[PDB]
Subunit: 210 residues, 2 copies
């Protein structure tokens, strides 16, 4: 495996859409827990070259599991620079996917197309396997899943949609913490489970502080 | 090799959490389009007959694609009666799965386990394949996904979790119509596309009326 993974990450001020339920301190710990999980899953699928791409060393000073990479530019700028310098296929993976497994990561990066794309909630992109980093450009934010699919083509690459519920579950708002509680394992899940419980009220399942 | 498939369906007042982005009249029309697409996927997967289990004929007055079975009892009571009278495997599929493909239904009903289960959001159950109906009891609503796995294990039977983003997108609230616009094809999607567009605002996708 000549293939690298890079994880965009910023610990400071993380997950402000969780601020109705989680403190600032809670939110940054939670995001640290998720990062450590995605890194540990990437290793477990036998990917040993793991990069973190961050605009500061904050919460990354003692990190040894993956190379910390500093880059203060915005996401798309930073990732396109990285893709430029890449010389072996690249898996761009978000840090907020605590339901993502070694198995998912294997099947994604075993695509037979040039690009494998995992969608997130709301038209985002949770995971991007790119075989030709010199041929590809990315554009996160907004309607990125579809914009990555037409960047793939517009650039003479073919692409796979990886159809996964678990991989598709990015944690961004309080309601996504119900998914985590129902479906996850690990310190990220345990952390959330130490502060909330699930309760049925509307014939429906809701999060409630413990 | 044989098997029955049932779709719990009630056109009237169908999808109240879609109000107020949709009307009564719109809700009932939408739901009917979604039903039709599910029955077409079941047929596309070669399943010989499909039952629709509905508390009235309303919206089913003309209906030749599937046998209409009437049962005025509560969902679980009706489904649990249907299960008792089946001998062969039963796929229970919700009528609100417009991203569900014949390929998903082929794979679900080919499970090598005793039950296959497809999660929907907030711990719901979007599709349930039960090989031994005599040994299974359903309980939709609330936390039904976790309940059906534990109904399975309490009963000796092993279960597969079918991990699919598309079969796991049930369309129940406004934010779900975003997913339909991004990922879907077909009449239910065209219906919505005729009334809304996607718009990007906080670096995020939102549904806005035309």
């Amino acid at each position: 495996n000549a293939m690298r993974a890079v994880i965009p990450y910023k610990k400071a001020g993380a997950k402000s859409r969780l601020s109705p339920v989680l403190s600032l301190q809670e939110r940054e710990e939670f995001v640290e827990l998720m990062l450590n999980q995605v890194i540990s899953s990437l290793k477990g699928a036998g990917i040993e070259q793991v990069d973190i791409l961050s605009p500061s060393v904050y919460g990354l000073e003692e990190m040894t599991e993956a190379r910390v990479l500093l880059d203060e530019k915005d996401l798309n700028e930073a990732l396109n620079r990285y893709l430029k310098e890449a010389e072996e296929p690249v898996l761009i993976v978000m840090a907020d996917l605590p339901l993502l497994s070694p198995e998912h990561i294997k099947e994604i990066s075993s695509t037979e197309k040039d690009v494998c794309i995992v969608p997130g909630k709301g038209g985002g992109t949770n995971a991007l396997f790119i075989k030709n980093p010199s041929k590809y450009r990315v554009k996160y934010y907004g309607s990125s899943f579809l914009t990555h699919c037409s960047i793939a083509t517009d650039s003479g690459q073919d692409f796979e949609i990886y159809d996964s519920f678990m991989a598709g579950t990015d944690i961004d708002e309080p309601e996504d913490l119900v998914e985590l509680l129902i479906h996850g394992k690990g310190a990220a899940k345990d952390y959330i489970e130490s502060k909330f419980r699930l309760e049925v009220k509307k014939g429906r399942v809701g999060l409630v502080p413990l």
